Design a protein around this ligand. Structure first.
Ligand SMILES: Cc1nc(C)c2nc(CCc3nc(N4CCCC4)nn3C)nn2c1C
Ligand SMILES: [Mg+2]
Ligand SMILES: [Zn+2]
Length: 313
């Protein structure tokens, strides 16, 4: 009741910034997440006992893969926390509750392989879910954990509030399928520019929350250069293992996944920053101006990748 989570001073101040790194001490990540729910939502949003039991079951259903792991989950939630705290008055009580949970849960039981590899391997999940294969699985794992005894953090919601929060989480998690991002951003670009964009239109909120989910998901490109660069090593460690597996099925992987194109990594980052990251944070900054520090940070890491190509590192 009268129990606030607090953080040491450097974390208490830096967690409020977009570029915060949750650090290498795993055992502090649950408390960092609770701290963020408390300040973003309130000490009354969730019963502490249920929340803690929920957090630990979520942690236990993330696997020890190089990138799509528990650290990524808390990282993506911290970015959402930053967006929600800098746009306080734009979001409902249900959205605040639902979106940090969605971020923690958005990659549950990831195996380090893309939807494409699941479809080429012919994995059972690819028969159950023809599109956004892993993302329907992640939402499925979230509902499972919510239904374990002592884990219903939403137990105090009405029947219809419950259904609205699970529907926010489902759409938030689906939107993390980057195949969906391009069209979603295009539509938001056009609606913003013709001034049709309308935050009372629920289908418009849906798209804006979807672009926030892509922004939070890609936030490794918005960190200090040493964090960005070392995270890229984890990202490629998965993609190259996927490349190896593709070759094992008798298939040339795409260049992104072929460890024989290690030398081309700087140029692949440029493409990625130009085709995905920069457009993502641009459109987000237009729609929510106080998210601009993500665009500024993204542009700085693009310069760092340009510097790498030029031999300046
Ligand atoms: C946060 C984040 N999230 C995602 C999903 C992601 N994907 C990537 C790979 C980009 C990439 N590399 C290459 N190649 C490398 C050498 C040969 C081709 N092509 N492309 C497109 N970085 N990345 C980051 C940093
Ligand atoms: Mg994912
Ligand atoms: Zn993710």
């Amino acid at each position: 009741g009268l129990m606030q989570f607090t953080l040491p001073v450097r974390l208490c101040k830096e967690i409020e910034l977009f570029h915060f790194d949750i650090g290498p001490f795993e055992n502090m990540w649950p408390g960092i997440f609770v701290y963020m729910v408390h300040r973003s939502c309130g000490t009354s949003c969730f019963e502490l006992e249920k929340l803690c039991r929920f957090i630990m079951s979520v942690k236990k259903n993330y696997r020890r893969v190089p990138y799509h792991n528990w650290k990524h989950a808390v990282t993506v939630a911290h970015c959402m926390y930053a967006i929600l705290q800098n746009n306080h008055t734009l979001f409902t009580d249900l959205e605040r509750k639902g979106l940090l949970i969605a971020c923690l849960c958005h990659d549950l039981d990831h195996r380090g392989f893309s939807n494409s590899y699941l479809q080429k391997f012919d994995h059972p999940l690819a028969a159950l879910y023809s599109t956004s294969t892993m993302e329907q699985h992640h939402f499925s794992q979230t509902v499972s954990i919510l239904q374990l005894e002592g884990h219903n953090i939403f137990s105090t919601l009405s029947s219809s509030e419950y259904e609205q929060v699970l529907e926010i989480i489902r759409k938030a998690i689906i939107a993390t399928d980057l195949a969906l991002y391009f069209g979603n951003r295009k539509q938001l670009e056009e609606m913003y520019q013709t001034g049709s964009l309308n935050l009372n239109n629920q289908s418009h909120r849906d798209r804006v929350i979807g672009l926030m989910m892509t922004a939070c998901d890609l936030c490794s490109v918005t960190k200090l250069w040493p964090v960005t660069k070392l995270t890229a090593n984890d990202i490629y460690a998965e993609f190259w293992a996927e490349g190896d597996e593709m070759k094992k099925l008798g298939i040339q992987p795409i260049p992104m996944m072929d460890r024989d194109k290690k030398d081309e990594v700087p140029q692949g980052q440029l493409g990625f920053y130009n085709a995905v990251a920069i457009p993502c944070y641009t459109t987000l900054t237009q729609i929510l101006p106080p998210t601009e520090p993500l665009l500024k940070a993204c542009r700085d890491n693009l310069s760092q990748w340009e510097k790498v190509i030029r031999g300046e590192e």
